[PDB]
Amino acid sequence: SSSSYRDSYFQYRHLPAPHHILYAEWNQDILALPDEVANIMTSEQNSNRYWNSFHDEDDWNLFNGMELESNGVVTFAGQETITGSIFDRRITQLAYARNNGWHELAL
Amino acid sequence: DSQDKIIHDIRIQLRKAATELSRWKLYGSSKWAAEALAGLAEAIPQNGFGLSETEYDLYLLGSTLFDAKEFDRCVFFLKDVTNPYLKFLKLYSKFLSWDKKSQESMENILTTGKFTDQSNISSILKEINTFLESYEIKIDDDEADLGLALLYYLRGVILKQEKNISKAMSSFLKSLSCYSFNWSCWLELMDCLQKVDDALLLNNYLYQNFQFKFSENLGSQRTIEFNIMIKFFKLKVFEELNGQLEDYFEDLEFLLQVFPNFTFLKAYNATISYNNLDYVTAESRFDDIVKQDPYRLNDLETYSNILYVMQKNSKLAYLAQFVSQIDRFRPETCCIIANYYSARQEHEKSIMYFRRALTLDKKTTNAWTLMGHEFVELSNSHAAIECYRRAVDICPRDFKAWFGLGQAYALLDMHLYSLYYFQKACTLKPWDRRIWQVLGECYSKTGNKVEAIKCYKRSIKASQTVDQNTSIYYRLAQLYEELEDLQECKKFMMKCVDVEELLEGIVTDETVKARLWLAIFEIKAGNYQLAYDYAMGVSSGTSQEIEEARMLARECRRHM
Amino acid sequence: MIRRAPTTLQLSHDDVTSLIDDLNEQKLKQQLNI
Amino acid sequence: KEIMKNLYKINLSKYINTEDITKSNEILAKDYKLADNVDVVRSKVDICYTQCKFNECLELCETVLENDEFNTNILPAYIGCLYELSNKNKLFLLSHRLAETFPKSAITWFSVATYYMSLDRISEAQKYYSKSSILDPSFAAAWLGFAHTYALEGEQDQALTAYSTASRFFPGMHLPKLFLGMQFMAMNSLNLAESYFVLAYDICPNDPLVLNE
C-alpha cells in the first residue's frame, strides 16, 4: 500500500521522539486560568477585591456603596444620599464635596 | 578594519558549518550553527563532496531514510559502502537506532546510572577501528577531510557512553583539530569534564600543543586567539562548573561585539546575572529575549524560576498559559507550569507536573529538589525524604538536595538525625550565613551549647550586612546566659542594641527583648540612670513590651 | 464599542413540519397509481 | 495646504468613500517623513476594525503599542480587537498593566470589564461598566457595553430603558437606534423595531449591520 509516503499531516516522524505517543494525554489538559480559580461566589468577590485594590482613598470612598441604575439616575452613599442623574458633570464633584469637605451645623 | 575582515570570514565559515552538518543529518551542531549566523552582526550557494554518481544515489536513499526514523533500514542498504563520508552515516544510523531503542525500552525507570558508580555497543566501536586502519590517511595529515574528522566524533561519543573516559577527549580533540565549528562535538567534551582543575588541565592543552588543520579551515581562522568556540569554550565551561575565571572577561565583550543579536549569548549573559543572585538585572536581560524571541523553550526554565521568587502570580499566569500553548513535551514547559500551580497552593497537582517534567529529560536533576518541596507542604514527610535522596544519588555535589533533605528531618523532632545532612551541606557552600545559622539551632536543640557558640560566631562573619545580625546577637547572648556567665553576654548585648542606633532607629522586635533584658539587669547593678534611657527607647514595641518598660521606667525614676 | 452577532434565522419547526406532511403526501399517493 | 488637508482627512469618519481616506494616507506616508506616525496607524487600525480586518488590526496595534504602552487614542479599538479575537491572556496583561498605572481613567476599568466579558461574566462586569461609565461621561463604549450586559441574559424589560438612555444622551450615532430596533424586534414587537431601524439607517447610510437588521 502507501501510508508513510504522504506527508500532508502531522505524522509520527514530525514530533522528535516517536515514543512520546505513550503519554499522548498532556494535550488534553485544561490548564487553570490565572486569577479566581485559585480560590477553589467567593472567587468573584476575591477577584473583585483584587482589582478593587487599585483606587485612591477618596476615589475608593466614592465607590464604597456605589450603585448605578438602568435609566442612568445615580445613587451615592455617604458614610445622606446624593441621588442624581449621571452625565452632568457637577453632580460627581458634589459627591466629592460632602465626602472630603468639612460640613458642620454649629448649633 | 581587522574586525570587519573577521566578520566577513565568519559568515563564509558558518555558511559552510551549517551546510555539511545539516547535510550529514546531525542537528546537535546544525541547529547551533544557523542561530549563530543569525545573530551575527550586520556588515551563490557553497557545496562540495567527493562522491561518485553511482554511490551518490545511495546517499539520497540513506539520507531520507534517516529522518524518516527508519534507521535500521538505512543500515541494511548502506552496508557495503566504503566511502568514509557514507561510512559515518551507516554507523551513526546504527548508533541512533540504539539510542532511540534504549529510550523506548526505559521510560518507567526515572533515575539513570549504575549502582557501583556494551557488547552491542562494542560492535559499532570495532567497525570504527577497522575502517579507520584500512583508510589511508588516519588523521595527523594536512589532507584530512571533514568526513574523517566527523568520524572521530562518533568514535569519541560512543566511547564515553561505555565510560571509557580519558580516551574520548583524545578523539574529540582530534576531531576538533581537523574540523572546528562542531558545537555538538563541544558539549560531549563538556559533559566529560568533572572538576575545575581538569578544566585548567585541558585549557592549557588547547593553547600550547593544539593547532587546527589550516588546510580544511579557512584563512584567518585557524589562529587560536581569533577563533570562536575557543572563546565560546571559555564562556560555557568556566561558568557552568562555576570555576575560576581566566581569559574570561576580554573574550566576553569580544563576543558581544561580534554577536549582538545572538539569542543564545544573551540568555547565557542573563543566566550569569541569575547565577550571581542578581535578579533585578537578569529580569531585564530575559525580557529582551521574550520580546525578541517569543518561542524559545531552552532557557526559560530560569525565567519562571525567577518569576516564582518574584511573586506576581498574575505575571506567572501569563507565562504558564503562553508557554503551554507552544507544546507540552519540552522539559521546561512542564516545569514552567509546575511553578505557577505551586504558587497557587495546589501542590497535589503541581507535584505531578514536576514528575512529568523530569520524565521527558532525566538530566534535569533540579526538578528533584522541587519535587520534594511540594511534598513538605502536603505534610507527607516520608514521601519527601526519598525525594531529596534521589537527587543526591544522581550527583553527590548538590547543595540544594542536601539542604532540602536536612530540613525535612528538621521539621520533625529529629534535630540530631538531621545534623549529618546539614553538616554535609556545609562543605558545599561554607560561605553562607543561612546554613551556619541553622547548624547552631540544631546544636542548640541538642544540648551542644559549647559547640553552638562557635557555630554562630562563624555565621556572624559570613553575613554581608550588619542588620541581619540582629537576630543572631540576641539568641547568641541567651546561650551565654545558660553557660552561667552573665558578664560575658553583656558584650554581645551591647552590640545588638547599638545596631538599632546605627540603623537610625530600626526598632526591631529582637532588639525589643534585648532592651527589656538589659534594663532588668541594670536594676540589679544599681545603675538606675543608665537603665532609664533603655526603657524609654523600647517604648514603641508590642503591648507587653511597652508596659514592661513603662513599669521599669517608673522603677528607675523612683531611685533616680 | 462592540457589535454583537447580527440577527439570523434558520429553518423553523412549522415549515419543516409542513414539508414533512407534504412529503408524506407524495410518498403516499404514487403507490396507489402503482 | 496639501499636507494639512491630508492630516485633517486622516481623522475623518469612516463608512463613506474609504478609498479616499486610503489614498490620502498613502500619499502622506511615502512623500513626507510621516510614514508610521501615531495618527496614521490609528486611522489604519480604525479602517481595519470597521472592515473587520482584524489580523491587520492587531499587527498595527502592537506595532504602535510597542512604542507607547499607554496611548489612550488607540486603546478602545485595541481592547475591542482583542475581545473579538478572545485573546484572554493579552487582555489580562493589559488589564493589569493599566490598573497598576491609571486607576482613575475609565479605560482601564473598561478593559477589566471586557476581560470579565471574555470569560462570560456578564453579571459581574455589569458593575465594572457602571464604574467605567461613571468615571468618564460621554463614553459610548462603556454605556453601550452596559446595555449589552443588560440585553444578553434575561432582564429584557429594562434593556429598553438602557438603550433609550444611550440614544438620548448619545445623539448622532446610529448604533444605539439600531440596538433599540433589534431589541424591539426581539420582543416580537415589529413596527417600533422598523421605526428605530429606519432611524439608525438615517443616521448612518452605509452599515451592514443596520441594513441586515
From Swiss-Prot, chain A:
One of its GO terms (biological process) is anaphase-promoting complex-dependent catabolic process. Pfam families: Apc13p (PF05839). It comes from the Eukaryota. Pathway: Protein modification; protein ubiquitination. GO terms for cellular component: anaphase-promoting complex; nucleus. Keywords: Cell cycle, Cell division, Meiosis, Mitosis, Ubl conjugation pathway. Component of the anaphase promoting complex/cyclosome (APC/C), a cell cycle-regulated E3 ubiquitin-protein ligase complex that controls progression through mitosis and the G1 phase of the cell cycle. The APC/C is thought to confer substrate specificity and, in the presence of ubiquitin-conjugating E2 enzymes, it catalyzes the formation of protein-ubiquitin conjugates that are subsequently degraded by the 26S proteasome. The APC/C is composed of at least 13 subunits that stay tightly associated throughout the cell cycle: APC1, APC2, APC4, APC5, APC9, APC11, CDC16, CDC23, CDC26, CDC27, DOC1, MND2 and SWM1. SWM1 interacts directly with CDC23 and APC5, and is required to tether APC9, CDC16, CDC26 and CDC27 to the complex. Belongs to the APC13 family. This is Anaphase-promoting complex subunit SWM1. It comes from Saccharomyces cerevisiae (strain ATCC 204508 / S288c) (Baker's yeast). The gene is SWM1.
Swiss-Prot record, chain B:
This is Anaphase-promoting complex subunit CDC23. Phosphorylated by CDC28, which is required for the early mitotic activity of the APC/C in its CDC20-bound form. Coiled coil: none annotated. Changing residue 64 to M: In CDC23-4; G2/M cell cycle arrest at 36 degrees Celsius. TPR repeats lie at residues 149-182, 229-262, 263-296, 297-330, 331-364, 365-398, 399-432, 433-466, 470-503. The APC/C is composed of at least 13 subunits that stay tightly associated throughout the cell cycle: APC1, APC2, APC4, APC5, APC9, APC11, CDC16, CDC23, CDC26, CDC27, DOC1, MND2 and SWM1. CDC23 interacts directly with SWM1 and binds the destruction box (D-box) of the substrate cyclin CLB2. Component of the anaphase promoting complex/cyclosome (APC/C), a cell cycle-regulated E3 ubiquitin-protein ligase complex that controls progression through mitosis and the G1 phase of the cell cycle. The APC/C is thought to confer substrate specificity and, in the presence of ubiquitin-conjugating E2 enzymes, it catalyzes the formation of protein-ubiquitin conjugates that are subsequently degraded by the 26S proteasome. Changing residue 84 to S: In CDC23-41; G2/M cell cycle arrest at 37 degrees Celsius. It comes from Saccharomyces cerevisiae (strain ATCC 204508 / S288c). GO terms for cellular component: anaphase-promoting complex; kinetochore. It is found in: Nucleus; Chromosome, Centromere, Kinetochore.
Curated annotation (Swiss-Prot), chain C:
GO terms for biological process: anaphase-promoting complex-dependent catabolic process; cell division; chromatin organization; protein ubiquitination; regulation of meiotic cell cycle; regulation of mitotic cell cycle. One of its GO terms (cellular component) is cytosol. The modification Phosphoserine is found at residue 12. Keywords: Cell cycle, Cell division, Mitosis, Nucleus, Phosphoprotein, Ubl conjugation pathway. The keyword Translocase does not apply. Its main location: nucleus. It comes from the Eukaryota. The APC/C is composed of at least 13 subunits that stay tightly associated throughout the cell cycle: APC1, APC2, APC4, APC5, APC9, APC11, CDC16, CDC23, CDC26, CDC27, DOC1, MND2 and SWM1. CDC26 is required to tether the essential subunits APC9, CDC27 and CDC16 to the complex. Component of the anaphase promoting complex/cyclosome (APC/C), a cell cycle-regulated E3 ubiquitin-protein ligase complex that controls progression through mitosis and the G1 phase of the cell cycle. The APC/C is thought to confer substrate specificity and, in the presence of ubiquitin-conjugating E2 enzymes, it catalyzes the formation of protein-ubiquitin conjugates that are subsequently degraded by the 26S proteasome. Belongs to the CDC26 family. This is Anaphase-promoting complex subunit CDC26. It comes from Saccharomyces cerevisiae (strain ATCC 204508 / S288c).
From Swiss-Prot, chain D:
TPR repeats lie at residues 1-29, 39-67, 74-101, 106-135, 140-168, 175-203. It is found in: Nucleus. Changing residue 57 to Y: In CDC16-264; G2/M cell cycle arrest at 36 degrees Celsius. Phosphorylated by CDC28, which is required for the early mitotic activity of the APC/C in its CDC20-bound form. Component of the anaphase promoting complex/cyclosome (APC/C), a cell cycle-regulated E3 ubiquitin-protein ligase complex that controls progression through mitosis and the G1 phase of the cell cycle. The APC/C is thought to confer substrate specificity and, in the presence of ubiquitin-conjugating E2 enzymes, it catalyzes the formation of protein-ubiquitin conjugates that are subsequently degraded by the 26S proteasome. Belongs to the APC6/CDC16 family. Present with 2753 molecules/cell in log phase SD medium. The APC/C is composed of at least 13 subunits that stay tightly associated throughout the cell cycle: APC1, APC2, APC4, APC5, APC9, APC11, CDC16, CDC23, CDC26, CDC27, DOC1, MND2 and SWM1. Interacts with AMA1. This is Anaphase-promoting complex subunit CDC16. The gene is CDC16. The chain holds residues 426 to 638 of 840 of the full protein.
